[PDB]
Design a protein around this ligand. Structure first.
Ligand code: SUZ
Length: 1229
């Protein structure tokens, strides 16, 4: 724990805490360089982990008394409520002064609105009394703008505290476990409910306080608007009592979808895994045509079901913007029809109020109804999880282990105990050998000695420290030295002695950094034997009194195991209590005592000498930023630019019809009080405005908004869902015809991440974010336009703010990237701290180390908590500097309009002031959407980068051979060379061979000599060098499928694909069922398939797991027989094959392929000596090419040495059958 740079919040006043002035050095540092983990600030030292964990644990433990004294029901929510209710109302007085300054504001606006109607003479007194009204209006909006971010931050800070308090108490509980219950459950859920049950706490507390502040406004504004003109206020409210349950009937219908189409988007990704894991095998089968139709058919229902909710979800965003002119149209058409007058002093006072009461329950109060059950469903689960059960508390100087009549049960449901009357006593210096069959109860006996097994009968006594090693090598994250120490002090001499006695010198010499290299989970880098070795070394390093070994020597070979035994067990622990368990009887001669277990009963206990005189046999008992190019490419991939121009025109004439909609309200108000009032003084006229002319125009103009909203929110979605439909087809038909070399570079994990993650982000998340930005940007351009097209004196003092705003954005959006990247880096150093501890906790509590289990977890919690405050206080710095340019524009539009009194007639005064009052609140939401768009735009690169992959050659080229090809198969190799990569190491070096008609020529060589490369060049897997001539026709002039369909191959690893056997044997349905049945009877697999009810349509599992390797080899042989090709190739098909089915396959290929040219490559020499000629390949070069018998006469040959290497009798039988077939072929008479 280093004294890093603390937070300056403690040395700051209230002004710098509100304005976030203490973030200047951090921004200055992040602007000039890159921020790292060593540049973060510390959290408040008041409650890091312990003051938040123990305070919550105390109340929960005290609640147990109030639950046991009555014994009715346990409650966990009560402990949470009685803990934070002490300070919850101190923050509830801030929601009463701030949320109430939005109702008095229209009251003050109306007092200035109705002032210009009496300024005929000089009335400075009336201006003197209005100066206060024009000052309170601009003074009230200051608190409403600069006193909201602090409250938001103070509310958001309460969530992370509860999250940390819940995450701290969930780990200390899993140290008093109930293993039988742990065995009943699965460890895949305890670590799982840690990334989803803590994120909801940071959101519910934000809108939870609006519950009692919501309906209050719906009464206050209701009364203030009923005190208006009259009872005509009910028609406008009648709409927003049915508009609320109207959007809830759409969600229920949407819930039927987006859950039904998951049987088409989760069925192709899994199938792609089967076809992409073996492209090396599927490429040379000419089966891409039979498999492309499967994915094409599946890609015929996803988009068709997506565009049945793409409209239902797009019509919802077109109503939220159009509902601002329906509540205003109805309330006036029922007020003008009753008979009254129209003045500008009773219009904007209610129009502005028509939004504050609207955006309170429509968007601000669904969350306090929907985000409550999600934050209460986890509480009724965590409580039950933490209240499962607990364990029973348990604890002459002579160190000894005494066991007398021990009898215990693993589970109470078992009728037969695993241990039946075990009685044995060991002493310091004796070696107790534990041997027995698999499952006799040795490991359970060691666990009982450790005390992990609950004793039902008998008593055990242990005196001293116990060092136990499990059968499965357990290891935690850390270096080798830290793993061996396990909290102990580092002693150079002792460490060297343990390393020498346990033989880690070769392992440290082979590894680069020695014992200082960090090891991940499970120790994947080191082999299991090395893990067992380092575990034994750590166990013996503890210098304990009792040692229990659970098979630590079986994970290595004989020599090293004897080494470790004779140098550690016989020498180091010759004075300690050792109870070792081994299955090898070679180490029982050095053991002082041998105890045998069988079915839980103690057979015999004694030394190795007593077992010898008894005549008992041990063997018998053991046998059973984004550039414009990407945007242009995404815009041009949807359709022609004409639809984009039409959409721009539609948007222009859907935005121009929104500002002009209120122009009629001003034209009607500036005509009623113009000359129609002069009836008593100023004139005498009884005429009035024509009701059948203004109302009709208003109705014809207000219908030009809903009709221009459905045809404006149903084209962008279609374009964006059609572009993704054509960008995927040009990315899938160019990944199956790729070279094999490309697949060997990228792994399977990095090649499957471009078809599941960034394949659906451009369908739902991209359009919903892109449409919400283009409809918000046109909404802010109409607010500055109405303030300049009225008073042409505001455009001059407007360029400094515009210049400041552009420089402020690219001063903040160049540093928040590092803050968000560092948080995600140290986001989860928890999951790999418990997943590797809950699987091997059987020894974490047998060392009395519970003290060093919480301090390590708290260290990883602080590292993550010190990175969340930095991100939470960062967003509150740009939002306090963006509200300072919006709280200045309102003052310069009021004071500049008040000085021009004798220029207007309150019309422009009302218009320009009713539009610049709602700017604060909508100018900050547009910036977050643009940032999200810019952040989600770097994701779409791989879908467009994989669209220009090179190809080798078309499947067919030209001038297919006449229907007489192929023939007997005279193969002529004329200086052919093969290379897996262009310019890489050459594999074949001038191979020249002549294969005659109907001859059996086989390939033999060591591993890596080039056996597979020969068949790879023969099947034209890669373009080879030279001239390879088959059937007197060059293979380069013939297409790939025309060559691959006329040749059959039996690979080394028989890979079978899922589906029916009909498609596996004949995917093109070119053969009849009778031929398939005849082939299956000839391969002798007809009886093994008749027992299944789906003989012709068995649903075969992945990779042929339902059948053995021999059955798969027979299936491939039947496939090659059904192919009826004149060229057969076998490469290591009989290496892992039992001798019976091996000789069966040999007889089958000798009977059916007698007139066919076969290429037999096998590792066993018994399946090659019966061939006509053999090819011994060495380092890619051929050495001898002749019959097997004439080669054996030369003792200096290589194949003779390989034959003699298998033994004397084997080589004798081999040369005997070789001479036999030689005399049979070359001398028939
Ligand atoms: C600050 C704020 C938040 C916090 C958040 O982002 O979670 C928010 C959350 C929502 F679900 C919806 C809206 C808002 C919002 C301000 C705001 C709301 C509406 C408008 S109107 C123009 O649609 C303008 C601004």
């Amino acid at each position: 724990y280093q004294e890093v740079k603390p937070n300056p919040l403690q040395d700051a006043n209230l002004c710098s805490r509100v304005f976030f002035w203490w973030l200047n050095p951090l921004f200055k540092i992040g602007h000039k360089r890159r921020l790292e983990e060593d540049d973060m600030y510390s959290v408040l030292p008041e409650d890091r982990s312990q003051h938040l964990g123990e305070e919550l644990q105390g109340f929960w433990d005290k609640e147990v008394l109030r639950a046991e004294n009555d014994a009715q029901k346990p409650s966990l929510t009560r402990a949470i409520i009685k803990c934070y209710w002490k300070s919850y109302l101190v923050l509830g007085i801030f929601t009463l002064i701030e949320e109430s300054a939005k109702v008095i504001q229209p009251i003050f606006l109306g007092k200035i609105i109705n002032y210009f109607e009496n300024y005929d003479p000089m009335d400075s007194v009336a201006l003197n009394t209005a100066y206060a009204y024009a000052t309170v209006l601009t003074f009230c909006t200051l608190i409403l703008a600069i006193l909201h971010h602090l409250y938001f931050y103070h509310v958001q800070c309460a969530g992370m505290r509860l999250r940390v308090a819940m995450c701290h108490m969930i780990y200390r509980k899993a140290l008093r476990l109930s293993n039988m219950a742990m065995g009943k459950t699965t460890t895949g859920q305890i670590v799982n409910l840690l990334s989803n049950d803590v994120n909801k706490f940071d959101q519910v507390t934000v809108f939870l306080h609006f519950l009692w502040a919501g309906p209050l406004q719906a009464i206050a504004v209701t009364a203030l608007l009923w005190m208006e003109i009259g009872i005509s206020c009910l028609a406008g409210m009648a709409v927003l009592i049915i508009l609320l349950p109207l959007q809830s009937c759409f969600g229920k219908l949407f819930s039927s979808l987006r859950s039904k189409t998951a049987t088409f988007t989760d069925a192709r990704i899994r199938t792609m895994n089967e076809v992409i894991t073996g492209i090396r095998i599927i490429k040379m089968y000419a089966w891409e045509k039979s498999f492309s139709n499967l994915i094409t058919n599946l890609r015929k229902k996803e988009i068709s079901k997506i565009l049945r909710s793409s409209c239902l979800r797009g019509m919802n965003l077109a109503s939220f913007f159009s509902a601002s002119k329906i509540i205003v149209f109805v309330t006036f058409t029922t007020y003008v029809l009753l008979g009254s007058v129209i003045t500008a002093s009773r219009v904007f006072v209610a129009v502005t109020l028509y939004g504050a009461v609207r955006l309170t329950v429509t968007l601000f109060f669904p969350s306090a109804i929907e985000r409550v059950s999600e934050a209460i469903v986890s509480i009724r689960r965590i409580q039950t999880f933490l209240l499962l059960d607990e364990i029973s508390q348990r604890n002459d100087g002579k160190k000894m282990v005494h066991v007398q009549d021990f009898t215990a049960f693993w589970d109470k449901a078992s009728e037969t105990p695993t241990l039946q009357g075990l009685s044995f006593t060991v002493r310091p210096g004796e070696l107790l050998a534990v041997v027995g069959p698999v499952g006799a109860g040795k490991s359970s006996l060691l666990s009982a000695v450790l005390g992990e097994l609950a004793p039902s009968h008998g008593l055990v006594s242990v005196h001293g420290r116990i060092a136990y090693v499990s059968q499965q090598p357990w290891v935690f994250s850390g270096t080798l030295r830290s793993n061996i120490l396990f909290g102990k002090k580092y002693e150079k001499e002792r460490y060297e002695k343990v390393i020498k006695a346990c033989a880690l010198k070769k392992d440290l010499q082979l590894l680069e950094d020695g014992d200082l290299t960090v090891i991940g989970d499970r120790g994947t880098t080191l082999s299991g034997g090395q893990k067992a070795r380092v575990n034994l070394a750590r166990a013996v390093y503890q210098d304990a009194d009792i040692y229990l070994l659970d098979d630590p020597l079986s994970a290595v070979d004989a020599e090293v195991s004897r080494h470790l035994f004779e140098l550690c067990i016989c020498q180091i622990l010759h004075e300690k209590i050792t109870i070792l368990v081994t299955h090898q009887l070679q180490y029982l001669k050095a053991a002082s005592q041998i105890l045998i277990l069988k079915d839980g009963k103690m057979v015999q206990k004694g030394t190795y000498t007593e077992f010898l005189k008894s005549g008992i046999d041990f063997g018998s008992l053991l046998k059973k930023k984004v550039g414009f190019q990407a945007y242009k490419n995404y815009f041009r991939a949807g359709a022609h630019w004409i639809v984009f121009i039409f959409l721009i025109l539609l948007n222009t004439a859907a935005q121009v019809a929104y500002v002009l909609q209120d122009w009629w309200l001003s034209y009607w108000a500036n005509k009623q009080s113009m000359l129609n009032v002069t009836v008593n003084g100023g004139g005498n006229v009884t005429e009035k405005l024509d009701l059948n002319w203004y109302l009709g125009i208003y109705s014809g103009l207000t219908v030009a908004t809903v009709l221009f909203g459905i045809a404006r929110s149903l084209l962008v979605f279609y374009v964006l869902v059609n572009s993704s439909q054509t960008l995927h087809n040009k990315m899938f038909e160019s990944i199956l015809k790729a070279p094999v070399l490309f697949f060997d570079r990228n792994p399977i994990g990095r090649i499957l991440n471009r078809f599941s993650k960034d394949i659906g982000h451009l369908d739902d998340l991209l359009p919903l974010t892109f449409l919400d930005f283009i409809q918000t940007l046109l909404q802010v351009v109409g607010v500055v336009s109405v303030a300049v097209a009225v008073i042409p004196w505001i455009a001059i003092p407007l360029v400094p703010l515009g210049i400041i705003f552009i420089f402020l954005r690219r001063y903040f959006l160049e540093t928040s990237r590092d803050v968000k990247r560092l948080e995600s880096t140290t986001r989860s150093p928890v999951f790999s701290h418990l997943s590797s501890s809950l699987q091997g906790l059987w020894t974490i509590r047998a060392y009395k180390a519970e003290e060093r289990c919480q301090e390590l977890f708290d260290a990883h919690q602080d590292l993550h908590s010190e990175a969340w405050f930095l991100f939470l206080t960062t967003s509150r710095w740009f939002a306090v500097r963006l509200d300072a340019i919006c709280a200045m524009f309102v003052i310069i539009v009021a004071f500049g309009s008040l000085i021009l009194a004798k220029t207007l007639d309150a019309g422009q005064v009302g218009l320009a002031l009713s539009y610049a009052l709602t700017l604060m609140g909508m100018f900050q939401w547009c910036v977050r959407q643009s940032a999200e768009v810019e952040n989600m735009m770097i994701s779409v690169e791989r879908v467009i980068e994989y669209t220009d992959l090179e190809k080798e050659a078309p499947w067919e080229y030209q001038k297919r051979p006449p229907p007489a090809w192929p023939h007997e198969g005279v193969i002529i190799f004329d200086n052919v060379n093969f290379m897996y990569s262009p310019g890489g190491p050459l594999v074949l070096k001038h191979l020249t061979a002549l294969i005659k008609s109907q001859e059996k020529v086989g390939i033999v060589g060591r591993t890596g000599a080039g056996k597979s490369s020969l068949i790879s060049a023969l099947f034209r897997l890669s373009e080879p060098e030279g001239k390879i001539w088959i059937d007197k026709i060059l293979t380069t002039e013939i297409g790939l499928h025309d060559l691959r369909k006329k040749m059959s191959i039996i690979p080394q690893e028989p890979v079978l694909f899922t589906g029916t056997m009909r498609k596996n044997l004949d995917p093109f349905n070119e053969h009849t069922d009778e031929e398939l049945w005849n082939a299956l009877q000839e391969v002798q697999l007809k009886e093994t398939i008749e027992d299944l009810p789906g003989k012709m349509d068995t649903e075969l599992a992945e990779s042929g797991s339902n059948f053995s390797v021999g059955q798969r080899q027979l299936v491939c042989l039947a496939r090659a027989i059904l192919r009826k090709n004149q060229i057969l190739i076998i490469d290591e098909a009989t290496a892992n094959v039992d001798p019976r089915t091996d000789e069966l396959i040999q007889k089958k290929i000798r009977e059916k392929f007698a007139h066919c040219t076969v290429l037999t490559i096998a590792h066993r020499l018994n399946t090659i000596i019966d061939s006509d000629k053999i090819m011994v390949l060495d380092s890619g070069r051929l050495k001898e090419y002749d019959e097997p018998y004439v080669l054996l006469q030369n003792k200096e040959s290589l194949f003779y040495k390989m034959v003699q290497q298998l033994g004397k009798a084997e080589a004798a039988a081999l040369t005997e059958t070789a001479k036999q077939v030689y005399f049979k072929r070359n001398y028939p008479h």
